[PDB]
Amino acid sequence: MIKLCREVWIEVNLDAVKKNLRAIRRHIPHKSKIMAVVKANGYGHGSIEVARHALEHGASELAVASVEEGIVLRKAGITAPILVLGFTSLSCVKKSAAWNITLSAFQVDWMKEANEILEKEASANRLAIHINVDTGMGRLGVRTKEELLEVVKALKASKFLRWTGIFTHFSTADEPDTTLTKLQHEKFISFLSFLKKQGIELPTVHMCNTAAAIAFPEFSADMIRLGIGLYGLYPSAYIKQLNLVKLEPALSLKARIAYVKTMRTEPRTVSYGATYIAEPNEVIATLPIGYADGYSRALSNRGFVLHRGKRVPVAGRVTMDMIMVSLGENGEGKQGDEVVIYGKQKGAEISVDEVAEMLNTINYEVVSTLSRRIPRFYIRDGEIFK
Amino acid sequence: MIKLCREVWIEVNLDAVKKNLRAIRRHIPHKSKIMAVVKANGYGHGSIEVARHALEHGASELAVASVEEGIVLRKAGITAPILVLGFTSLSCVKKSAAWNITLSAFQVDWMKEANEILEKEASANRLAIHINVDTGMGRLGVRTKEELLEVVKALKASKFLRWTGIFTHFSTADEPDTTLTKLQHEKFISFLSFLKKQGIELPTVHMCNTAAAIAFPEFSADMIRLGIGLYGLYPSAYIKQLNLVKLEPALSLKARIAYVKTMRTEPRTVSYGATYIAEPNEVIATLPIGYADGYSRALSNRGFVLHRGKRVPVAGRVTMDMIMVSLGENGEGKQGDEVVIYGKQKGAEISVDEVAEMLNTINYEVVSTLSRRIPRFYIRDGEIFK
Ligand SMILES: [Cl-]
Ligand SMILES: [Cl-]
């Protein structure tokens, strides 16, 4: 089946991504479109194949972190609209207009100089722009209704720019306390009511992330931005509890056993620092994955893997390329057996959310730090490719 | 100068690498060679440019973690010997011989099957082999002198394999207690001599790592394997104490400020969870780096960066692609200023050892988990390229 020189890989199940998209479509209003977020190599899953599938099954537009990440998508043949969520330097204004990438802006002087650059070169293309309004996140965006109007005034006087959206971001929509979420919404609405009482037409309006699409579908306005929900992961345990929508996890991580031996001769120390000493009838197995792959060293003498449907412990310290596990006295196993690191095997499961708890972080970090030297295989209609 | 759409990057100083190899060459015996270890994408530094440069200034062989990492070096132009340190699957025996990668091996049965595959194929490609002897690490390799004799005969009968080395690995040579390191050395020296009593002639012997070579230079034998010391960093605080060799770190990490504002309007919340509230006078600057780049989320409300020669702190949680830092009341800063994340600025420093200490890990892991989505630039002789 799968053939590798070093035997470790990732499996990503696209049939699961498709069911996550259907669950979200039925729950939100029909007038509202879906923009799929695939920044940071598709939250670790691989960005090319997941953007392709998503656009075949419900998404209309895409979001990324930087001009460079959008260029990898256009090079694979994707023609849909693509919005950059971070800040972009004026260095890349000409390049973004040529690959037809949409950028966010919120400054009167950036607006002005962006227009000049494309003016002084004639340019048949018009750069599309989305305005970001800061109602409580404190990261980027415009902050008062009077200076938002200067920006609207300026963007309108720019013949080489095109206004195609306006948006904001919720900073606590995954927590039981809904105080601040209700306040940001109130502020955002009054700024567009301000702009509307002057003859200004509004383009596409969007505010919801995964959690706010599930708890407040009445905020869906024109469009939502589906992020961690697309990969089948819940933004918090509280949003998982309201039992409103059913998601399925897309990703598992596997490998094959490299060597087996019984610890009969001395010494019987195991790994750097000699932090674990074996028994003379103990069986010890060696796997090809390490902390340079993204398997945290903090799981030394702590975490597990699944061999033959059993949980088994890491023995000693994690190293850069390999880990060691214990099979017990007279344990059972062969060079070449299959092991599951994140995922499900026979009747067992080690979930991404468990490993995240064990390390005191959130599931976003676990998946999106898995290295690119590990190959990703895709399963669609129960079969393999790439 | 440095022109990017998203403004974050790494710099590798290759004049540092050259000085670090000079120091080592002048510590060990003149009759010993140096094998340079560049696995895991050169410990996060880039494998192609560091190997190219190390082969020109003192090294003669190279080591990697897998066949795939070796082939990237052949495709870049390199004709030096390349040894794979982990376990290689029998289904890559034919590719290794074709690209001329040296494989590690330690089982009688692996040897014969690898010989039969090359017999049914011809091609003047004999596959070269190093034998791994386990003396206390417990990871890979053979563990009794009677077993080692069987494998040396199975190999000397095999007409298409070629025997070019034998090695071992020390698990505690960076610690001040030398007990277990001397035990391992006694075990290895005896096994070698039992082969001599039988009339067997020996190839290249190697056993030392960076700490082993600084601390026990008289264990050098034919060859050493220089890894972490290549990049200007010490194996342990203890080996820095001895004060025997002077190393200079080769890597730093930088970005440019994306936005600056005063928190006059309300509300004054910052980042996810609203874990931080600002004064009506406070200045907040936004930076393009996040945990998907390898900047740990455990640095929320804890870490530092250098801006104009002074440390300023992270404010709020780290997010996937951006962080916020407080410039204080009063303020002082503009869009486009240069910030140092790891390294030096004026007479100030945030070293990689310092950050690994703050996160309860080792410098090995801080460098080699830096994402391939950050671009790398190289300095050689005071000038920049890629
Ligand atoms: Cl934002
Ligand atoms: Cl080993």
CATH number assigned to the domain comprising residue A376: 2.40.37.10
Say whether both B194 and B224 belong to one domain.
yes
Bridge partner residues of B63 (DSSP) = B37, B83
Cβ atoms of residues A362 and A371 within 8 Å = no
Taking phi first (over 0 means left), then psi (-120 to 50 degrees means alpha), and beta for anything else, what does residue A190 get? alpha
Measured CA to CA, the distance from residue A293 to residue B369 in angstroms comes to 8
Give, as one character, the DSSP assignment of residue A156: H
Examine the domain organization and report whether A78 and A200 are in the same domain: yes
In angstroms, rounded to a whole number, what is the distance separating the alpha carbons of residues B311 and B60?
A: 42
Asked if the structure places residue B62 within a domain, the reply is: yes
Q: Which residues of A touch B360 (CB under 8 A)?
A: 298
- Pull the structure tokens for residue B95: 């590719």
Interface probe with A: pick from B3, B5, B188, most Cβ of A within 10 Å: B5
Are A267 and A364 members of one domain?
A: yes
Does some domain include residue A6?
A: no
The DSSP code for A133 is: B
| Boundary of a domain, candidates B199, B231, B263 | B231
B274 within a domain of the structure (yes/no): yes
Q: What is the DSSP letter of A3?
A: -
Asked, for residue A235, whether it belongs to a domain, the answer is no
Amino acid at residue number B197: K
| Burial degree of B1 (CB within 10 A; 0-12, 13-18, 19+) | exposed
- Decide if B35 contacts B21 (C-beta within 8 A): no
Range of the domain at A268: 251-385
Same-domain check for residues A54 and A152: yes
Alpha-carbon gap, residue B310 to B33, rounded angstroms: 44
A362 touches chain B (CB under 8 A): yes
- Closest by CA to B251, choosing from B135, B355, B109, is B355
E strand segments, chain A: 8-13, 33-37, 61-64, 82-84, 102-105, 127-132, 161-167, 205-208, 223-226, 251-256, 259-262, 282-287, 304-307, 310-313, 323-329, 338-345, 348-350, 376-379, 384-385
- B265 CA distance to ligand 1 middle (Å): 17
Residues A262 and A214 grouped into a single domain = no
Cβ within 8 Å, pair A172-B273: yes
Residues 316-345 of B with CB under 8 A from A: 316, 319-322, 324
Cis before B267 (ω within 30):
yes
A255 shares its domain with A141: no
- CATH code, A111: 3.20.20.10
Spacing, Cα A138 to ligand 1 middle (Å): 7
On whether both A108 and A192 belong to a single domain, the answer is: yes
Which position among B75, B196, B272, B310 bears the catalytic label? Answer: B272
- The string of DSSP codes covering A251-310 is EEEEEE--EEEE--SS--B-SGGG--B--TTEEEEEES--TTTT--GGGTTT-EEEETTE
Contacts of B97 (CB under 8 A, 6+ apart): B118, B123, B125, B126, B127
A175 and A309 inside one domain: no
The answer to the question of residue A240 being in a domain is no
Q: Which DSSP helix (H) or strand (E) runs through A95?
A: helix A93-98
The annotation status of A25 as a binding-site residue, yes or no, is no
The distance of B173 to chain A (nearest Cα, Å) reads: 9
Residue A315 burial (10 A CB sphere; 0-12, 13-18, 19+): buried
Per the domain annotation, does A237 fall within a domain? Answer: no
| Experimental method, per PDB record | X-ray
For residues A262 and A147, membership in a common domain is answered with no
In a domain, A11, yes or no: no
Residue whose C-alpha is closest to residue A355's, from A302, A292, A289, A287 = A302
Number of structural domains (chain B) is 2
CB-CB contact of B64 with B227 (8 Å): no
Using the Cβ of B190 and the Cβ atoms of chain A, whether some distance falls under 8 Å is answered with: no
CB contact under 8 A, B138 and A272: no
Looking at the fold, whether A64 and A195 belong to one and the same domain comes out as yes
B19 touches chain A (CB under 8 A): no
Domain boundary pick from A173, A195, A230: A230
A94 plus A163 within the same structural domain: yes
Resolution given for this structure, in angstroms: 2.3
Last residue of a domain, one of A230, A261, A277: A230
Is B182 part of a structural domain of the chain? yes
Token representation of residue B111: 């040897």
Shared domain check, A224 and A131:
yes
